[PDB]
Design a protein around this ligand. Structure first.
Ligand SMILES: O=C1c2c(c3n(c(=O)c2O)[C@]2(CC[C@@H]4C[C@@H]42)N(CCN2C(=O)C=CC2=O)C3=O)CCN1Cc1ccc(F)c(Cl)c1
Ligand SMILES: O=C1c2c(c3n(c(=O)c2O)[C@]2(CC[C@@H]4C[C@@H]42)N(CCN2C(=O)C=CC2=O)C3=O)CCN1Cc1ccc(F)c(Cl)c1
Ligand SMILES: [Mg+2]
Ligand SMILES: [Mg+2]
Ligand SMILES: [Mg+2]
Ligand SMILES: [Mg+2]
Ligand SMILES: [Mg+2]
Ligand SMILES: [Mg+2]
Ligand SMILES: [Zn+2]
Ligand SMILES: [Zn+2]
Lengths: 368, 184, 368, 184
DNA sequence: TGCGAAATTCCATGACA
DNA sequence: ATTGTCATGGAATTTCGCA
DNA sequence: TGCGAAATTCCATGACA
DNA sequence: ATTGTCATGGAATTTCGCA
């Protein structure tokens, strides 16, 4: 834009160029005496190359790119031009970290009845004990009642074998699990359809979704650790002891044990609660139905000062799962198809695939 | 006197020898006295070790105050007595040759022996895989005397597998001839 | 204490036992009709065994152990007895997690002059490039100026070889590093004594102490990642490009590049700042001395609501470095010998060894 | 006219062939025109590739606006001209057989040639390891004309290694006889 | 003596594995 | 015998250009 | 109708690799 | 086509025992 700069040198006003400054010609280039010093005003036709050259030195963000440019040049709304470049640098978009936190977590309603929802997951590999390396953890959502099964691998075969023993007691409406090879298999889907069990899956690489079982994994390990202090790690024989120990342990916030929430009566275990001895099983089952409904339910916490929530059509980027050494931590921009809830979203990547992801594994693409 | 409750008394007994299925020959039968809930464990023998191996699984879910059985060798052994003493379980025995349990229990054990027999005919070597379905059937079976099924009495909720189809349990003339053909 | 319980049954008042309750005898045991129900009052001589039996079921904390006990018994100040037991359970003390956060971080003063303090660390293993797997990062504390050296291992030999090339420019007062094999060696101590360089070491397993270099490690990798997008990871030839790129990059908060803080003048690099062209080198060096002193210094952040700060004589526990599977995450209690600063401490473990640790790798032993 | 600054002009030259030390035979000498700061890189030849390999290390710390050298083959080559063009470095040459630099620089290059000679005598094969100490010596050497050392002029601070001991630099009668013994 | 917009400053967020 | 750091891009706040 | 102490509730912290 | 959870032990607050 040498035409735009011509009128400037003459002396007549152009939108963006402050009138109170002296625009002169020197060394065959339009200059301006600014408070900071004399800066070259490059023609609009040159500014993109300049912004790009400055940015490409260390692939710097807004201010660091501006501070370089400002050493030599001046032009109206420089940062608008810096930001246009940042938003078009594929390398910056896929390598840089987010600076916007996810919206506050959801506290899904507790399943209403026992056997409405199970949460399943594997712990392991653990030190080999009796040829076993893994533990299948099954947590009833409503009660917290846990069933532990030692396995030789986190396989479909071992899950099916174990779940066939569990399901002899009662059959669940839904089985929630993560996207582990063992649960996403066709053989497992077949095993569940065959029984009227609905398989629900967590968003990928988001274990907080399986929070219920994950949290119980912590207790199982903490207790095994304690019981194995100063002894070899022979956990296989402890699984039943741990299962019974935990299923009969008070949750200080509920003032109930998973056993009590499942049966409404302690069995012949130490310190069994005697409070309903004079009640009939019906009077007892009535009180249990009342306890199950009145349990404490946590509320969503306050959103952090700089949180972001998904919007349909928003350009968002998925986190690379197992990023190789010296490779980007982010995927290329994607479009938000549907906002399932404020923490779960459906995205369409560049390939054309529909993915249901957690906002924890997303960042909103910067500079729009 | 305090009302009857679950885990007050478990009635245990062995069914078998049955035709071998997955190397197993017996079924240890555990029936909760109050609810009538049934747990079935396949064993390879009616021994104390097989009883202890099986009951160790059950007693990881709930411990009964009393275990009731006949004077079978597996239950009268000092090993079984030591196991129960360790768990604070009182052992109880019926008089030899006079097996007394309870009306509900006697009736339940009858349904078990009959339901097993019904499904054995045709597939006498496939019963290992059927124990979970047999158990769900038995536990979602309406009690005419109590108005509720053993699943309802134990959990205080309806089951996701209601067994509304009240089957024959009595062998068909076709199953009778097929059953008398196996006994050869 | 059957003597203590005798006076109770009679009817005369004992300190701790509320007078308004009816203390009777039944089944050969002292009982009490409490609002919750009738509870057995065990003799003081029995309470320790009871508390221990309840606790040992699932090695539960205060409330969960109390809720079990309270099902059968009642005695004055039950929790005092529960807490005495918790504080004596070695398994609980070494396995349980802390619930008290560290005090707020210190923001050590920026070194006054260049070469006063260097921060050194290794990045790697990286994808092999020209037989090289590691990068030796040397950050001047005052300026941020970085020197990158490709190495075949994080060895003393490679550090010495590299540092001999660096030290041809200037010799530093102090070299701060972590406790890596390469820097804690006798050969390295010898190399530094030989030069008047004082070796300073970070508390073990606390990379925030080497914060200055660690943070620069992030930039080096972010830039290498960007420059290697869609190309094989041949980083060896990029080290000089990256070094120059970063040393000449603006720190938006300082409004200076590490080069400018080291020399007070840009070299012949793109967008070199021309602001001191008319100044003499002396006028320029004078302004540089003024810039170096006026740089922004961050302040310690507010302490979290539930923070803990070390006290001499306090029973504290060190974190197990590489805890084996199913093994405790904590060491046995230790005594705080000296509080070096509110974030660094000297501890004496059970062995009798003096260790200078970070409070981030400590937890205050619960129940005193 | 604008005052002299660091990185305005680097004066480069080769010293050697020297007795081989760690396979190296030459020293490329870089002297900043303004501060008089010296950088010494050992090469295996006075070639363009060895000059480019060495200067690529230096130009990763700071880039001079101008490089000044004599008409040596390594500096007059089109490869060296392409390298400098890429870095925006202007090349400058002294007239053949008439090597002009600057007073400060001519004097510095003299101290370099003499300091190297002084330490070569006795250990002519150990000079590779000495280049860092030689460089620190040279850069913490007080300038009578400027009042400051090259370390002070470049960094604007005192050095942690002040070379207060102003050594002879002139060979002792013992070093003279030992030097004339090597030349055999 | 005050407006609208641009420039600058602030600062939470996240990563140095 | 030691100790976090700072690029980043929206938001908040200050400054600029004009009157 | 209010005191001091015990009991209960709250809730940040950290780990499920 | 889904979604965090909850034991833990100091601190805060409520309740108890007595008057
Ligand atoms: O529980 C898990 C966990 C984890 C993983 N996986 C699980 O099944 C699983 O249950 C799988 C295994 C296969 C399947 C796809 C899933 N992978 C992929 C393969 N892989 C690696 O990439 C590294 C280890 C590993 O197995 C996980 O990384 C890691 C987090 N943790 C602990 C945790 C951390 C933070 C929290 F907030 C919570 Cl609540 C829980
Ligand atoms: O920088 C490091 C880092 C780390 C380690 N080490 C370093 O030298 C080092 O520099 C050594 C290596 C040997 C020496 C004893 C130290 N080990 C022990 C052996 N080892 C493992 O136990 C696991 C990997 C590994 O090398 C570290 O774990 C991990 C954290 N990071 C990144 C980081 C994380 C969080 C932060 F906040 C900051 Cl600022 C930085
Ligand atoms: Mg999993
Ligand atoms: Mg998991
Ligand atoms: Mg019998
Ligand atoms: Mg390190
Ligand atoms: Mg590091
Ligand atoms: Mg010459
Ligand atoms: Zn970029
Ligand atoms: Zn314990």
């Amino acid at each position: 834009l040498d035409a735009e700069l011509d009128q400037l040198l003459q002396g007549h006003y152009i939108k963006g160029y402050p009138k109170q400054y002296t625009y002169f010609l020197e060394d065959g280039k339009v200059k301006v005496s600014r408070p900071e010093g004399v800066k070259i005003i490059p023609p609009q036709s040159d500014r993109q190359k300049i912004v790009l050259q400055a940015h490409n030195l260390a692939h710097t963000g807004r201010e660091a790119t501006l501070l370089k440019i400002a050493n030599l040049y001046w032009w109206p709304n420089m940062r608008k031009d810096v930001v246009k470049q940042l938003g078009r640098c594929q390398q910056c978009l896929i390598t840089n970290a987010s600076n916007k936190a996810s919206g506050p977590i959801l506290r899904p309603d507790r399943p209403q009845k026992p056997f409405d929802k199970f949460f399943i997951d594997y712990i392991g590999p653990l030190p080999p004990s009796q040829g076993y390396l893994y533990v299948l953890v099954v947590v009833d959502g409503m009660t917290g009642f846990t069933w532990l099964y030692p396995t030789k691998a986190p396989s479909t075969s071992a899950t099916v074998k174990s779940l066939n023993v569990l399901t002899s007691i009662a059959i669940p409406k839904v089985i929630h699990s993560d996207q582990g090879a063992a649960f996403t298999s066709s053989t497992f889907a077949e095993w569940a359809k065959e029984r009227g069990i609905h398989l629900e899956f967590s968003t990928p690489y988001h274990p907080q979704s399986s929070g219920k079982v994950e949290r119980k994994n912590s207790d199982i390990k903490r207790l095994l650790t304690k019981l194995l202090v100063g002894r070899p790690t022979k956990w296989y024989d402890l699984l039943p002891v741990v299962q019974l120990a935990l299923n009969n342990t008070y949750s200080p916030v509920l003032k109930y044990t998973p056993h009590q929430l499942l049966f409404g009566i302690d069995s012949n275990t130490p310190f069994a609660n005697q409070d309903t001895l004079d009640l009939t099983r019906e009077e007892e089952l009535s009180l249990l139905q009342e306890i199950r409904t009145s349990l404490y339910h946590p509320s969503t916490p306050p959103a952090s000062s700089r949180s972001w929530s998904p919007v349909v059509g928003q350009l968002v980027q998925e986190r690379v799962a197992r990023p190789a050494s010296l490779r980007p931590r982010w995927h290329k921009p994607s479009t938000v198809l549907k906002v399932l809830n404020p923490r779960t979203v459906v995205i369409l990547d560049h390939l054309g695939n529909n993915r249901t992801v957690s906002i924890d594994n997303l960042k909103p693409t910067s500079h729009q | 006197d305090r009302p009857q409750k679950p885990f007050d008394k478990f009635f245990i007994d062995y069914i078998g020898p049955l035709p071998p299925s997955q190397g197993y020959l017996y079924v240890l039968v555990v029936v909760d006295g109050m609810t009538g809930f049934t747990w079935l464990y396949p064993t390879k023998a009616p021994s104390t070790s097989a009883t202890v191996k099986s009951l160790n699984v059950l007693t990881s879910i709930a411990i009964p105050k009393v275990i009731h059985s006949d004077q079978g060798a597996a239950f009268t052994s000092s090993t079984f007595a030591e196991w129960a003493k360790e768990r604070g379980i009182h052992l109880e025995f019926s008089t030899p040759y006079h097996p007394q349990s309870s009306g509900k229990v006697e009736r339940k054990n009858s349904d078990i022996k009959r339901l097993l027999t019904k499904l054995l005919v045709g597939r006498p070597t496939k019963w290992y895989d059927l124990l979970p379905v047999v158990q769900l059937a038995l536990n979602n079976t309406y009690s005419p005397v109590l108005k509720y099924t053993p699943h309802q009495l134990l959990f205080g909720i309806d089951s996701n597998t209601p067994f509304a189809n009240q089957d024959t349990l009595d062998l068909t003339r076709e199953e009778e001839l097929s059953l008398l053909q196996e006994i050869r």
